[PDB]
Symmetry: C4
Subunit: 103 residues, 4 copies
């Protein structure tokens, strides 16, 4: 149906308009950064291959969680705790962003 | 007791009333599409029984998470990461939607 | 500090005012129901002691997840999938509720 | 590049500006209180090393979840359930807050 495609595209364009918003860009960059850091941290401190460090970081920053791995070192656990709150703060940021975008 | 039932019905009506929104519908189809892709991907690449691939896909895409399985291949891992952001995208989309339907006038 | 206690109490009263809202009551009852059902389902179909069925239901309906148990039977898995979406729908319900409560 | 930095700072200022809200503060203290209680509870009742009790408490209260540990006692289980709803309460509270600070005027 054309109605369907048209609606989808209207929405896609709306999503694209966001990647053009400075504040949204910031939020985006910060999480990308946060993802890099985490990848690096768990790679060195917890000794996980980069890909498994990125995975754990993602799955953790998004609250999906890893059904197998858990930080072994104490330093790892502390970092993971603060890491998670950064994620909570990051998502509220987007939430607030969207809540404002309508008005 | 009666107001409970009456309120429930009014709300239950609304949920359906929103099931008529063109944008809600697309989000729904996109989610179902995402769910189907995941199911295929994981049964294929991770060799998971189809029902296990759909299950992993659902719990992964909703941030619930699987307490036992994790992709074993680097391929599955990469896909899961992006898959999760799709999910995050889908949910914000719904949230944005609800946000608009509230602050309407 | 008195300022602190006063603010807290103002907020507690606000939370209490909600338990007096019919629509909120509904949302509440539905999840309680949903929790009962789940407890029963996983108890019989997956053979978990009621307490472990309630736990799995809660941890699953709230997206916390169980780091050990996963449904073994196919019927269990299908139910868990629909169960989770009920939860997503239930939480959006509260979300919408709150988003309206301000205006 | 400069607008990035300038925007970041303006936003970074706001987060702090909100750290001055009396209601945000209480929510924060309540969360810290909840976190401390959990840490005590789990090290005591579940015999978890203090840092493991705080960790389990954080991942549990944020719906992230622990991929390896689960309370072993029926006592720990009951507590975890309520604990999770406290967390759900805390988050809605913050959300409600953000909701109000947006739709202000
Ligand atoms: Ca596990
Ligand atoms: K998990
Ligand atoms: K979650
Ligand atoms: K969430
Ligand atoms: K989770």
């Amino acid at each position: 149906m054309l109605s369907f495609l048209l609606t989808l595209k209207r929405m896609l364009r709306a999503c694209l308009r966001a990647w053009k918003d400075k504040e949204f860009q910031v939020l985006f960059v910060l999480t990308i950064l946060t993802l890099i850091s985490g990848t690096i941290f768990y790679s060195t401190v917890e000794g996980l291959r980069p890909i498994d460090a990125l995975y754990f970081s993602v799955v953790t920053l998004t609250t999906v969680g890893d059904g197998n791995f858990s930080p072994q070192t104490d330093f790892g656990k502390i970092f993971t705790i603060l890491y998670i709150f950064i994620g909570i703060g990051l998502v509220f940021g987007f939430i607030h962003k969207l809540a404002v975008n309508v008005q």
